[PDB]
Design a protein around this ligand. Structure first.
Ligand SMILES: Nc1ncnc2c1ncn2[C@@H]1O[C@H](COP(=O)(O)OP(=O)(O)OP(=O)(O)O)[C@@H](O)[C@H]1O
Ligand SMILES: Nc1ncnc2c1ncn2[C@@H]1O[C@H](COP(=O)(O)OP(=O)(O)O)[C@@H](O)[C@H]1O
Lengths: 325, 114, 91
């Protein structure tokens, strides 16, 4: 625990041992709501329920079986949209996904390879490390916590854990975050080359085929000089298609962006000289979903996503589709 | 348009009680019945205990059951709540809101299509 | 253990001019549903207050303007509480 790198190394071990010692259940509020959708819900209705509840995602319920039937995220739309844009000779064909029940949308995704065979879940009373490792293995950014009622065989969806709520939980509870004082430019962490970026003139469909192919949740928007202006997230796709208007997919990123409500998480940035202590501190007080590494001139240099951070702190060291967003 | 306990009803309480029993019977539930104490009926007639076979269990050969108690309340003259609560699940051989809530949706559809 | 029946009581199936008892009036505790709360939605909008232990696994309901059913119940999961709000078709 001697110099900076040696104090950080130590602190990272304390943080993993802590993740291992807690369960996923430990992360939950004492009392909370869980919004669940029937898999036979129409796609349009489900987007409408997501907007009106200010959520971007919901667990699915096959009520006949009494079984968890998957996780509806924006990756579902991003993947089918991308498939239709790559494979269809007919631009209006995409509209057809409004005929679909959630069951039928998922079957299109199974067919194209956008859904894995083994669907991903952990037990709520198992270690939190299980949740991290599953998310790390799949590239899922949320994971359902499922128990089973032994009297009925019925599956009990307890909650759905997010990378953000796990990092928040750690920031709030592990004092060791304050000892992570190594600058980013002396760590192997984040992505610093071959970045996927867009401009305000970029078509939304080209961004959305960036998100699927690269399997990222967001694309930074830069200008001619490379200065960071904004972001286009997969959650923004929801606002574009919540009304049934799939020709909104043909808009420039600029036009699309002018429709965004003031509800925005925000665009967070840091410098290559910043450290994980300050980052966990921002996580503690703000819904930060990623950090764009910039210079003094707001020039984009890299990306530090939540997955980047989690995957750094949990390891001893030592398809063309978006995963669950 | 906010969340409220139960289902809203109006009109006559014996007419509502009848409609509830008819809905239970269409859904396939089994239920207790009003007994008259000294020939006369008591307001406990508005407390119904129901037993429901669980479809997913029933399909796999199982005698597992869900217990749901219904309670009619007057909110004000003409307006009633049907309160509906889980008493649990039991298999013939020796927690969760499901299948309870999947059964309540069944009841609600029968009440609404009567 | 109860006497379960399959058939509708016959006094209810008669053509009404019978002198019957009234249901109990609504108790104060079934007037407020905790889902109508969102006190702390800046930090975490899923956070609810602790429920009245007597209102565990009572059905709650909401109107939607969407052609679907909204149903919920609160239950204890070990020492925490989950209020699941479910959206479901009629057919
Ligand atoms: N625009 C981009 N171009 C290239 N690589 C990226 C870009 N954005 C993220 N990455 C990298 O690609 C991988 C996928 O990132 P991703 O954004 O999916 O993280 P995440 O799990 O979604 O967490 P967050 O929600 O915070 O982004 C990560 O290792 C990330 O650092
Ligand atoms: N299916 C759901 N049911 C109930 N609440 C949800 C659901 N999805 C999200 N929320 C709530 O919405 C808020 C923002 O959620 P989200 O953006 O999905 O996750 P995070 O904030 O963890 O990245 C959180 O308070 C979360 O608990």
């Amino acid at each position: 625990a001697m110099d900076v790198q040696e104090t950080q190394k130590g602190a990272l071990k304390e943080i993993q041992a802590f993740i291992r010692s807690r369960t996923s259940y430990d992360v939950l509020p004492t009392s909370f709501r869980l919004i669940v959708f029937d898999v036979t819900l129409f796609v349009k209705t489900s987007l409408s329920l997501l907007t009106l509840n200010n959520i971007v995602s919901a667990p699915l319920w096959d009520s006949e079986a009494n079984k968890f039937a998957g996780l509806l995220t924006m990756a579902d739309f991003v993947n089918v949209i991308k498939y239709y844009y790559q494979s269809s000779s007919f631009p209006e064909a995409i509209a057809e996904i409004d005929k679909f029940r959630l069951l039928g949308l998922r079957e299109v995704e199974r067919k194209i390879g956008a859904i894995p065979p083994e669907t991903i879940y952990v037990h709520p009373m198992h270690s939190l490390m299980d949740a991290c490792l599953a998310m790390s293995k799949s590239r899922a950014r949320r994971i359902p916590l499922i128990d089973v009622d032994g009297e009925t065989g019925s599956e009990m969806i307890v909650s759905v854990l997010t990378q953000y709520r796990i990092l928040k939980f750690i920031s709030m509870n592990c004092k060791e975050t304050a000892m992570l004082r190594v600058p980013l430019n002396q760590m192997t962490i984040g992505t610093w080359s071959n970045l996927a970026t867009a401009s305000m003139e970029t078509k939304v469909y080209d961004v959305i085929k960036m998100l699927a192919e690269k399997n990222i949740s967001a694309v930074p928007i830069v200008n001619s000089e490379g200065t960071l202006l904004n972001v286009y997230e997969s959650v923004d796709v929801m606002h574009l298609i919540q009304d049934g208007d799939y020709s909104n997919l043909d808009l420039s990123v600029g036009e699309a962006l002018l429709k965004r409500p003031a509800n925005f998480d925000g665009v967070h940035t840091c410098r290559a000289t910043d450290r994980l202590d300050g980052i966990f501190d921002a996580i503690k007080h703000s819904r930060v979903h990623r950090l764009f590494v910039v210079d003094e001139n707001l020039k984009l240099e890299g990306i530090l996503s939540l997955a980047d951070i989690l995957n750094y702190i949990i390891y001893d060291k030592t398809d063309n589709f978006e995963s669950a967003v | 348009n906010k969340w409220h306990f139960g289902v809203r009803c109006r009109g006559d309480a014996p007419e509502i009680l009848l409609a509830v029993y008819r809905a239970l019977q269409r859904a396939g539930a089994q239920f207790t019945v009003p007994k008259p104490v000294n020939g006369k009926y008591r307001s406990d007639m508005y407390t119904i205990k129901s037993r429901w076979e669980i479809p997913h269990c029933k399909r796999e050969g199982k005698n597992t059951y869900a217990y749901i108690e219904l309670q009619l309340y007057e909110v004000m003259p003409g307006c009633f709540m049907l309160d509906v609560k889980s008493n649990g699940y039991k298999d013939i051989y020796s927690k969760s809101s499901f299948p309870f809530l999947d059964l309540c949706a069944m009841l609600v559809c029968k009440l609404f299509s009567a | 253990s109860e006497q379960y029946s399959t058939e509708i009581p016959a006094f209810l199936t008669s053509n009404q001019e019978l002198k019957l008892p009234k249901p109990p009036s609504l108790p104060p505790h079934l007037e407020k549903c905790i889902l109508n709360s969102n006190t702390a939605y800046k930090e975490d909008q899923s956070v609810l207050p602790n429920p009245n232990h007597v209102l565990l696994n009572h059905l709650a309901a909401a109107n939607t303007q969407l052609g679907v059913l909204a149903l919920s119940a609160t239950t204890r999961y070990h020492r925490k509480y989950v209020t699941t709000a479910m959206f479901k078709n009629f057919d």
